[PDB]
Design a protein around this ligand. Structure first.
Ligand SMILES: Nc1nc2c(ncn2[C@H]2C[C@H](O)[C@@H](COP(=O)(O)NP(=O)(O)OP(=O)(O)O)O2)c(=O)[nH]1
Ligand SMILES: [Mg+2]
Ligand SMILES: [Mg+2]
Length: 427
DNA sequence: ATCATACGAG
DNA sequence: CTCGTAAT
């Protein structure tokens, strides 16, 4: 009881932009606002692949990884914004710059770990303690949480907003505002700060976002998706047993692939909560020492992964696929594309160095050969001593000359090219 | 025929 | 080091 850790030591939030790429295009082109719309890359093949979908468009069934032509069938009036193309490939610069706008605002409030182009984890433990000291023992008004949902409430003895208020009222009524060490109280204050954060992001960028507040990253991330869009959700330690009782295992971060599938099949279970019935050693025996320990604690709502203080991406890369009959087959083609990638990379690296006082020191070159099922067929690295596209492209070629078979021909033909800058050091 | 863009195991 | 897995 007393010596049992409950994983209520920190206050962690996850802020994720709503239909991010769409909002970026909607801010730029007002004609797209408040309409069914999506972001697509590469129109020629089947209308292009959809990578972002507005909530209005989702109502029609449009989704990610869908061909625009097919989406148009579900939603005839679907509006489409195209990803920029430069040097023969998709260019995501607009989205990276928009992401920076958001990350910089969040970093004002606390240490953040950039988890993706549109979301970041926030460690609000220190901020809440400071906020708690201020306005000590004074009741927290519901007005301070206009967009917050308390998971699992209301409970006990017909409109969604009405439902939200009810739950919120039960939560606040129950709170013990006098004990500054109360974990629930701490989450509540964290929620207040996140309201502030989200208001700042929308006021200063025009972008709306959702957020999750909890004691760790997995629960915060999970909480965030519960009430999107434009809403934030508080998931307390106490709400975990009921929340996890019907939560499919694949919903938890890092359990959506093979590992999650193995848990389900080896253990013969479907929901996260069903994991509590196994001993740590049992879980370790099936999924390894690290995975077993993590599952044992996670199914109980406990996780110790820290919010890493990293606002910038660790790598800068450029990659292009060349499907089916379009696979690269000549020396001239390979070199041309390597140069295109090398040029985009060079501009991206030069800007990075000027903005972030760092320089990449290693260049990674990856390819795929036709007939290979894997994402990558081969990976090779070389020094990156100069930010020059011509040198990097030539170095890259040198590095992959070995795969080619004789004949100016290239074979087997290449289905993918990838250049990635890595191993940054201060500059 | 989606594509383009961190981390642990060995 | 390269590779496989994973999320967005
Ligand atoms: N190329 C590509 N880009 C993607 C993919 N998935 C996501 N993105 C890009 C495009 C996305 O807009 C952005 C954010 O990823 P989310 O947060 O997963 N989705 P969103 O923010 O759109 O909606 P909401 O969060 O409200 O559900 O990342 C993909 O599979 N491929
Ligand atoms: Mg998002
Ligand atoms: Mg996201």
């Amino acid at each position: 009881g007393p010596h049992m850790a409950t994983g209520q030591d920190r206050v962690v939030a996850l802020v994720d932009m709503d239909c991010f790429f769409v909002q970026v295009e909607q801010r730029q082109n007002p004609h797209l606002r408040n309409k069914p719309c999506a972001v697509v890359q590469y129109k020629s093949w089947k209308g292009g692949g959809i990578i972002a979908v507005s909530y209005e468009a989702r109502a029609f069934g449009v989704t990610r990884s869908m061909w625009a032509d097919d989406a148009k069938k579900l939603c005839p009036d679907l509006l489409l914004a195209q990803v920029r193309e430069s040097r023969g490939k998709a260019n995501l610069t607009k989205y990276r710059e928009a992401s920076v706008e958001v990350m910089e605002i969040m970093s004002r409030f606390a240490v953040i770990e950039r988890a993706s182009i549109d979301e970041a984890y926030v460690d609000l433990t220190s901020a809440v303690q400071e906020r708690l000291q201020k306005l000590q023992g004074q009741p927290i008004s519901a007005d301070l949480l206009p967009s917050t949902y308390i998971e699992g409430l209301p409970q006990g003895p017909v409109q969604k907003e009405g439902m939200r208020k009810q739950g919120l009222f039960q939560w606040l009524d129950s709170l013990q505002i006098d004990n500054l060490t109360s974990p629930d109280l701490q989450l509540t204050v964290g929620a207040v700060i996140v309201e502030e954060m989200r208001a700042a992001i929308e006021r200063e960028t025009g972008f709306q976002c959702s957020a999750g507040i909890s004691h760790n990253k997995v629960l915060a991330k999970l909480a965030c998706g519960l009430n999107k869009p434009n809403r934030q959700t508080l998931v307390s330690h106490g709400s975990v047993p009921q929340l996890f009782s019907q939560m499919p295992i694949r919903k938890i971060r890092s359990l959506g692939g093979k590992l999650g599938a193995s848990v389900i099949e080896i253990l013969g279970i479907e929901y996260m909560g069903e994991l509590t019935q196994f001993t740590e050693s049992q879980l370790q025996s099936h999924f390894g020492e690290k995975n077993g320990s993590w599952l044992y604690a996670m199914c109980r709502g406990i996780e110790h992964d820290p919010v890493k203080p990293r606002q910038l991406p660790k790598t800068i890369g450029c990659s292009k696929n060349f499907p089916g009959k379009t696979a690269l087959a000549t020396r001239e083609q390979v070199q041309w594309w390597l140069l295109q990638l090398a040029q985009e990379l060079e501009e991206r690296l030069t800007k990075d160095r000027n903005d972030n006082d760092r320089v990449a020191t290693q260049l990674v070159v990856s390819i795929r050969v036709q007939g290979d099922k894997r994402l990558s067929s081969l990976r090779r690295c070389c020094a990156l001593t100069r930010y020059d596209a011509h040198k990097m492209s030539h170095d890259a070629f040198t590095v992959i000359k070995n795969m080619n078979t004789s004949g100016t021909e290239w074979s087997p033909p290449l289905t993918m090219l990838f250049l990635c800058a890595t191993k940054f050091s201060a500059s």
